[PDB]
Design a protein around this nucleic acid. Structure first.
Ligand SMILES: [Mg+2]
Ligand SMILES: [Mg+2]
Ligand SMILES: [Mg+2]
Ligand SMILES: [Mg+2]
Ligand SMILES: [Mg+2]
Ligand SMILES: [Mg+2]
Ligand SMILES: [Mg+2]
Ligand SMILES: [Mg+2]
Ligand SMILES: [Mg+2]
Ligand SMILES: [Mg+2]
Ligand SMILES: [Mg+2]
Ligand SMILES: [Mg+2]
Ligand SMILES: [Mg+2]
Ligand SMILES: [Mg+2]
Ligand SMILES: [Mg+2]
Ligand SMILES: [Mg+2]
Ligand SMILES: [Mg+2]
Ligand SMILES: [Mg+2]
Ligand SMILES: [Mg+2]
Ligand SMILES: [Mg+2]
Ligand SMILES: [Mg+2]
Ligand SMILES: [Mg+2]
Ligand SMILES: [Mg+2]
Ligand SMILES: [Mg+2]
Ligand SMILES: [Mg+2]
Ligand SMILES: [Mg+2]
Ligand SMILES: [Mg+2]
Ligand SMILES: [Mg+2]
Ligand SMILES: [Mg+2]
Ligand SMILES: [Mg+2]
Ligand SMILES: [Mg+2]
Ligand SMILES: [Mg+2]
Lengths: 67, 96, 227, 106
RNA sequence: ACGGAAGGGCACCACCAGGAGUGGAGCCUGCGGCUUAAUUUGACCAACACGGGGAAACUCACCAGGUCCAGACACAAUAAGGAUUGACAGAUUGAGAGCUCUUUCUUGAUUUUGUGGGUGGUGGUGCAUGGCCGUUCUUAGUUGGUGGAGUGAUUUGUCUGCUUAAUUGCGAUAACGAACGAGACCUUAACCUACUAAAUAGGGUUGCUGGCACUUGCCGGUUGACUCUUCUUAGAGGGACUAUCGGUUUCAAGCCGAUGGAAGUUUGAGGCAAUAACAGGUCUGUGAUGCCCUUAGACGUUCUGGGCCGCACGCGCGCUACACUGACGGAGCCAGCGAGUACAACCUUGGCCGAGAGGUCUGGGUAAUCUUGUGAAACUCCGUCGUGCUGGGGAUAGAGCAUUGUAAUUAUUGCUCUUCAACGAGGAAUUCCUAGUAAGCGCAAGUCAUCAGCUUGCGUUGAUUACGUCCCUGCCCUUUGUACACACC
């Protein structure tokens, strides 16, 4: 039952829309980028944000996507 | 209350001398502390003085906090007939 | 004084409860807010945060003095080993206790319930709060009980953000027909909440990227060599 | 003429962590500043002071309980150190909440 | 709102497949009824081992009695040739109570008797109230600002679909932006041969020794030294985000599987937990409290004794059992939560006594130091028993020995010997529960001077059967109908 509610999806969308040249395919590098370029309070939310950012980046790499 | 006048004298002199009391709500105890008399008539005498309008009382967690107002000081001074230039220990300027 | 350390800490807590409730009973007319008990090697300092600091001190500084005396008898302390200190509240609007007592006082003078509650909420959000809420429960102009809610802004309810930001106060008011219950909740500004996190758990801030120019292809900018 | 080492011991208590750890760190830094030999801030099992209590003041309602608790952290420190500097350390850097106690043990 | 109307989803307080049960027996406890001077009372899914309700005194609220004012203050009134107080001894009393009397003696303006008033009340009213908690409701549901439709109550936003544990998202759109709830968040349980460290935790080497072997080795003892942090601790951090891959999905949200992992059910378990509401409970927790009642031979307070435990009967949590997968003897010997004395007397080691409960003498521990490695039970190994209500079961009684207690009879509780009852796996019916789970087993803590068969926690041994459904009982959204709105009671 993992659905990744509003906050992570919106934050990842803004992260991609403002930092696409710096984002990569790897989860760990994007995790460090999420740490440095954004002030996520906790770290579980940070990991979820980085994971959805990686998923959206992979979808973009496959092709162009809506939103 | 029927307080023998010497125990009441002790109550009054200690109260005027330093101004404050606690007087645990627990009645029937043998001796009230730093008074060497029964707590029961300590509480009753302070209640009578408060009814007169000389002691402000404040009950919280069974410790009957007592403080002397200015009219209380005047009444105690006249009753204990002490010279009129001495104030209770509260009035002493023990500031910072 | 020898006692088990866990019991000593429990006694320290119950002593703080002692002091807080006693000061609530006494300095209620003073807009009492809170008490801090600092323990030094020699003195047991007791800082009193209240609104009317100058009246709390009293004429010639006697009131505080007599208050000190009571404590020295309540806990069998020694002269000099304990000393009070009166301090003005940093901002009386933010503190729930002071607002609850003040609007209890306003209720005591027969002021309109709705007017007093809305004035309190307006002042609280004038102080910079990120949300205020007031529950007034009781016999509001009727024999049957009823509860009125006056809220503005947003108030969270779950997670220690309930403990971290929003502060609450509960008070009883005695009237000529019954008792009114007052609950006051204020969610402070998280950015100004020092000594802790400075945002909500789900508050995400993204740094705006810096804009740069890429056209410089060869650009071999030689520096002076060193050896 | 206080050259005799007192092999003194500094122990701590609190219901919180950050202030207690800060006080211990300042104590260790002060000890290092004057070239003091020590045993580090040895951690002690946080004693969980727990009380279970029924929520209903009147017994009516579905059986629902709660558990309030604190933790006490101790983190005692002992020093094979000179006299005056150690005491001066004890009477400085005190934070409300954390309680400092000193045993000479000499 | 309801439907024995429809669509789509959920829930072991529902079911299927099951497990353990309860309901049959005895007992403990809690209700009802009866009885009684009183057998004090409030609750009747969401009352009934609940009010922390394991009450011998106190508790206390009930009953038969006996005390006292702890009736402030103001005024009047007596009154200093006595307002008054107290008492030895006797009658009286249960009392060594000057409570009441016999006599007399003591005491000094605090008092005494009337008015106002005030206090005290586990007195009444939770259908006057607060606060708190419970429940509706563990589900995912609510709300307002501009904007659209309605004269309007209202409605759209809050939805055709698919997905999710989720008003969780993908989206489509007279809706756009938002707020509370959910999630996020904290505690806890894992993983850390990565950091910091440790005589209040452990380990190695080497000392100084004990024994057995004789080869330099094994199992030990020492608060002797040096050294280390793997386990034990606790701080800062790391770690998991469905990561990679393969399927399936308007190819989007997402689902399924495998692999690597410590961990892939939201990683497990929890803590907070929205709007609206109940005439749900609590005046019996509060010096929270409005009103009413009482306020002197008192519904105040205290003392003595009794009761809250009675018993023709019914019901609700449980405990011990009906035995062979067992009972009884020996022997093995394994935990984690705790807790523990100061103005009081706690946790108790160890040494002597006693058969045991227990007693005594000393010594530690205000606590990772001492109880304590809580050497706990179930369990394991070897024997006795041998299908016999039997060596099961241990209720009901008789006698004795001790402990706590001012006080133990109406057996407080523990121990020793004996009688050993019902009980043959328990009808209708009904309860809880899908992994370290249920179940078995005990220990600690709260009640505690003494007392648990209770509760809150902890750990040991540890499964069968699902991994689904709307059939019963309900819950969420939508559509529809209604003569219902105190709403199908
Ligand atoms: Mg929220
Ligand atoms: Mg939450
Ligand atoms: Mg059922
Ligand atoms: Mg079944
Ligand atoms: Mg059974
Ligand atoms: Mg039965
Ligand atoms: Mg029966
Ligand atoms: Mg009865
Ligand atoms: Mg229910
Ligand atoms: Mg009993
Ligand atoms: Mg009695
Ligand atoms: Mg009784
Ligand atoms: Mg009586
Ligand atoms: Mg009462
Ligand atoms: Mg009610
Ligand atoms: Mg709710
Ligand atoms: Mg409109
Ligand atoms: Mg609507
Ligand atoms: Mg380690
Ligand atoms: Mg895929
Ligand atoms: Mg969870
Ligand atoms: Mg009452
Ligand atoms: Mg009474
Ligand atoms: Mg009873
Ligand atoms: Mg029950
Ligand atoms: Mg037998
Ligand atoms: Mg152990
Ligand atoms: Mg037999
Ligand atoms: Mg009980
Ligand atoms: Mg299921
Ligand atoms: Mg009608
Ligand atoms: Mg009908």
């Amino acid at each position: 039952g993992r659905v990744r509610t509003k906050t992570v999806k919106r934050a990842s969308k803004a992260l991609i829309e403002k930092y696409y040249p710096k984002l990569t395919m790897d989860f760990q590098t994007n995790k460090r980028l999420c740490d440095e370029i954004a002030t996520i309070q906790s770290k579980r939310l940070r990991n979820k944000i980085a994971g959805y950012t990686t998923h959206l980046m992979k979808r973009i790499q496959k092709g162009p996507v809506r939103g | 209350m029927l307080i023998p006048k010497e125990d009441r004298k002790k109550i009054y002199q200690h109260l005027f001398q330093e101004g404050v009391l606690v007087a645990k709500k627990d009645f029937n105890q043998p001796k009230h502390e730093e008074i060497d008399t029964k707590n029961l008539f300590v509480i009753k005498a302070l209640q009578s003085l408060t009814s007169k309008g000389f002691v402000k009382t404040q009950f919280s967690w069974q410790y009957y906090y007592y403080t002397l107002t200015e009219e209380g000081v005047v009444y105690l001074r006249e009753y204990l007939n002490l010279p009129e230039h001495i104030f209770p220990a509260t009035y002493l300027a023990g500031q910072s | 004084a020898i006692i088990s350390k866990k019991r000593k800490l429990v006694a320290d807590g119950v002593f703080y409860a002692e002091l807080n409730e006693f000061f609530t009973r006494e300095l209620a007319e003073e807009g009492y807010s809170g008490v801090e008990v600092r323990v030094t090697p020699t003195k047991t300092e007791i800082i009193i945060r209240a609104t009317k600091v100058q009246d709390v001190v009293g004429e010639n500084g006697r009131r505080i003095n007599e208050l000190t005396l009571l404590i020295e008898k309540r806990f069998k302390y020694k002269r000099g080993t304990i000393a009070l200190y009166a301090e003005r509240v940093h901002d009386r609007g933010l503190s729930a206790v002071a607002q609850a007592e003040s609007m209890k006082f306003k209720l005591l003078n027969g002021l309109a319930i709705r007017r007093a509650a809305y004035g309190v909420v307006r002042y609280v959000m004038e102080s910079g709060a990120k949300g205020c809420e007031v529950v007034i429960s009781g016999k509001l102009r009727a024999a049957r009980a009823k509860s009125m809610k006056f809220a503005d802004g947003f108030l969270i309810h779950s997670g220690q953000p309930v403990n971290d930001f929003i502060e609450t106060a509960t008070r009883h008011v005695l009237l000529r027909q019954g008792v009114l219950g007052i609950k006051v909740k204020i969610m402070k500004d998280p950015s100004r909440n020092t000594s802790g996190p400075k945002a909500l758990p789900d508050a995400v801030t993204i740094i705006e990227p810096k804009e740069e120019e890429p056209v410089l292809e060869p650009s071999v900018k030689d520096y002076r060599p060193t050896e | 003429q206080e050259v005799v080492i007192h092999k003194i011991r500094i122990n701590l208590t609190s219901t919180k962590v950050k202030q207690l750890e800060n006080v211990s760190a300042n104590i260790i830094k002060n000890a290092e500043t004057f070239k003091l030999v020590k045993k580090g801030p040895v951690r002690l099992p946080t004693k969980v002071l727990k009380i279970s209590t029924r929520k209903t003041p009147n017994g009516e309602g579905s059986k629902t309980w709660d558990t309030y608790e604190m933790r006490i952290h101790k983190r005692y420190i002992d020093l094979e150190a000179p006299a005056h500097i150690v005491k001066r350390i004890t009477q400085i850097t005190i934070e409300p909440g954390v309680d400092v106690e000193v045993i000479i043990a000499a």
